[PDB]
Each structure stands twice: as structure tokens, then as C-alpha cells.
Design an enzyme around this catalytic site. Structure first.
Site, PDB file in Angstrom:
ATOM      1  N   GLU A 182       0.854  -1.215   0.000  1.00  0.00           N
ATOM      2  CA  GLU A 182       0.000   0.000   0.000  1.00  0.00           C
ATOM      3  C   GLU A 182       0.888   1.263   0.000  1.00  0.00           C
ATOM      4  OE1 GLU A 182      -3.079   0.327  -0.747  1.00  0.00           O
ATOM      5  OE2 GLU A 182      -3.934  -1.595  -0.357  1.00  0.00           O
ATOM      6  N   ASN A 208      -7.386   8.776  -6.023  1.00  0.00           N
ATOM      7  CA  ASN A 208      -8.219   7.819  -6.803  1.00  0.00           C
ATOM      8  C   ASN A 208      -8.892   8.560  -7.961  1.00  0.00           C
ATOM      9  OD1 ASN A 208      -8.989   6.489  -3.600  1.00  0.00           O
ATOM     10  ND2 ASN A 208      -7.495   5.666  -5.058  1.00  0.00           N
ATOM     11  N   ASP A 233     -11.873   8.535  -8.793  1.00  0.00           N
ATOM     12  CA  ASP A 233     -13.211   8.979  -8.313  1.00  0.00           C
ATOM     13  C   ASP A 233     -13.099  10.300  -7.539  1.00  0.00           C
ATOM     14  OD1 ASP A 233     -12.265   8.195  -5.747  1.00  0.00           O
ATOM     15  OD2 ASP A 233     -14.100   7.103  -5.222  1.00  0.00           O
ATOM     16  N   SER A 259     -11.633  10.766  -4.524  1.00  0.00           N
ATOM     17  CA  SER A 259     -11.147  10.440  -3.163  1.00  0.00           C
ATOM     18  C   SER A 259      -9.606  10.338  -3.182  1.00  0.00           C
ATOM     19  CB  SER A 259     -11.787   9.191  -2.641  1.00  0.00           C
ATOM     20  OG  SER A 259     -11.358   8.051  -3.378  1.00  0.00           O
ATOM     21  N   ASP A 273      -6.245   8.237  -0.904  1.00  0.00           N
ATOM     22  CA  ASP A 273      -5.771   7.209   0.057  1.00  0.00           C
ATOM     23  C   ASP A 273      -4.600   7.826   0.853  1.00  0.00           C
ATOM     24  OD1 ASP A 273      -7.707   5.484  -1.135  1.00  0.00           O
ATOM     25  OD2 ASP A 273      -6.187   4.151  -2.043  1.00  0.00           O
ATOM     26  N   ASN A 322      -8.939   5.473   2.740  1.00  0.00           N
ATOM     27  CA  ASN A 322      -9.608   6.224   1.649  1.00  0.00           C
ATOM     28  C   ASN A 322     -10.538   7.251   2.293  1.00  0.00           C
ATOM     29  OD1 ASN A 322     -10.977   7.123  -0.676  1.00  0.00           O
ATOM     30  ND2 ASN A 322     -11.302   5.068  -1.512  1.00  0.00           N
ATOM     31  N   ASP A 365     -15.459  -4.373   9.046  1.00  0.00           N
ATOM     32  CA  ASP A 365     -16.606  -3.835   8.270  1.00  0.00           C
ATOM     33  C   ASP A 365     -17.356  -4.969   7.556  1.00  0.00           C
ATOM     34  OD1 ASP A 365     -18.268  -1.772   7.235  1.00  0.00           O
ATOM     35  OD2 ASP A 365     -17.036  -1.676   5.389  1.00  0.00           O
TER      36      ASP A 365
END
Ligand code: NA
Length: 129
Positions: free
Chosen positions: A35, A46, A48, A50, A52, A59, A101
């Protein structure tokens, strides 16, 4: 901060990440390696819109507030900037909610594609723990 492999193993253990939700310390070190390359200040935008943040690339879409991710939640209740600290406590606390989650460590796409099913114990090999 850029952690050493065994140094990061020790930090994750001291913050109770080892065997959290049944994921061995090797799984967490491997996820971090792919990562962030163990770099606490890693940020990646990202497609989109967003971003990280940190050793585990948490995120802004769900988990932290960065003030520029429209329609987003902040379910760890922290500024994303706190995930770039040399002290990994905020990253660990928030990774504990993510791995809880429902989909376990599949939440980290790099973990699914690069660590899942591999010899992850090699990541803590020779480490004094
Ligand atoms: Na957010």
C-alpha cells in the site's frame, strides 16, 4: 517516516494489530509494504476524486475527512492528515474498523491481489517480537 519491516511489525504489535480479526502480523506488514512501501506520508488520488492516506492507504470516501471528497463519510472520525503521522496509532485504530466492516482485509485491494494466500510469515521472519 519510512519504517523498517521488523520495526513496523513491532509498532503494529504494540498497537494490538497482530492477530486482530484473525489476521496474523505478516498480513498487516505485507498490506503496508504494497500500500505505502512502509512510508507514513504516502498519498494517492483515486480516479473517483477520493484520496488514500498513510501506511495502509485509508480512503477519504468512507473513513477520514480531507474536505475535498464530495458525498463522503468520515467513519474513523479523524482528519485524513492524522493518518500521515510518524506515530501509526490513528492508522491502526482506523484499520481496526475497516477490517471489522465485513469483507476483512479484502478492503485493501493490494492485500487481496499481492498478500492473500501467500507465505505472509516471511514478512515477520527474523523479527524480534
Ligand atoms: Na471523507
Amino acid at each position: 517516516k519510512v519504517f523498517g519491516r521488523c520495526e513496523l511489525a513491532a509498532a503494529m504489535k504494540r498497537h494490538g494489530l497482530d492477530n486482530y480479526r484473525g489476521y496474523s502480523l505478516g498480513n498487516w506488514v505485507c498490506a503496508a509494504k504494497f500500500e505505502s512501501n512502509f512510508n507514513t506520508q504516502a498519498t494517492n488520488r483515486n480516479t473517483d476524486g477520493s484520496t488514500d492516506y498513510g501506511i495502509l492507504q485509508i480512503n477519504s470516501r468512507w473513513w477520514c475527512n480531507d474536505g475535498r471528497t464530495p458525498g463522503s463519510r468520515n467513519l474513523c472520525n479523524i482528519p485524513c492528515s492524522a493518518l500521515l503521522s510518524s506515530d501509526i496509532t490513528a492508522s491502526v485504530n482506523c484499520a481496526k474498523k475497516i477490517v471489522s466492516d465485513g469483507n476483512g482485509m479484502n478492503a485493501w485491494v493490494a492485500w487481496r491481489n499481492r498478500c492473500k494466500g501467500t507465505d505472509v510469515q516471511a514478512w515477520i521472519r527474523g523479527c524480534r517480537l
